[PDB]
Ligand binder design. Sequence first.
Ligand SMILES: CC(F)(F)CNC(=O)N1Cc2nc(N)nc(-c3c(Cl)cc(Cl)cc3OCCn3cccn3)c2C1
Length: 222
Amino acid sequence: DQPMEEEEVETFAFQAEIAQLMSLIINTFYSNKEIFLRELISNSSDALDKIRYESLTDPSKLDSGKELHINLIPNKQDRTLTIVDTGIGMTKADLINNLGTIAKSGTKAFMEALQAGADISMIGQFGVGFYSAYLVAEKVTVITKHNDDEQYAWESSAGGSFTVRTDTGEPMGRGTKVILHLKEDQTEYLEERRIKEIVKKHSQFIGYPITLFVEKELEHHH
Ligand SMILES: CC(F)(F)CNC(=O)N1Cc2nc(N)nc(-c3c(Cl)cc(Cl)cc3OCCn3cccn3)c2C1
């Protein structure tokens, strides 16, 4: 009797300061949590800038898809909010290096700044805005696809470690999906009016199309 699927899953420990930051963010009360969406859309914009720049000199970099955009996908049934871009994406090494194992100077800098009276909303200025996702999410899953490379899934519920594995689900052309599994009391960010007002207020100057796709599994077909 053979398995439908088998795949290797790697578990990595977060660098100590990153673990520290994630604990502070996911546990502490803050009154301006909506800033997470600005930070993720900002990361997507940056990733789109990168692939765009590459395509300036090598058009073939867009063979995996010419459209440069950001999609926002609330799914009330799964209690997930997903931010999708067709930006540059990440290799497996990028995931492991950039999402937890290597310490950035801005990680301790940001926590120092907060203790010195700075606001959480400055997190992006320290290059660690992604982790603001844990203001509203109990678990974050990142699915990513870089040119020439396989599609990978990174995941963490915090608590000191993350996992990486190959993603065999629906193949992306190129880019990154950040899937926020929301905290029970944070479901307001699945509502259309809330998403719209947050994008309007905080992401006004993003130079790529941002599109809402409200997702619902139709009855008996979940
Ligand atoms: C060489 C490379 F092009 F740079 C590899 N490409 C990446 O490293 N990324 C592509 C990407 N796309 C989205 N939508 N988000 C993230 C992102 C995530 Cl998921 C987690 C953290 Cl901690 C930081 C992040 O971006 C920080 C800011 N940045 C955006 C692009 C690059 N740096 C990344 C990282």
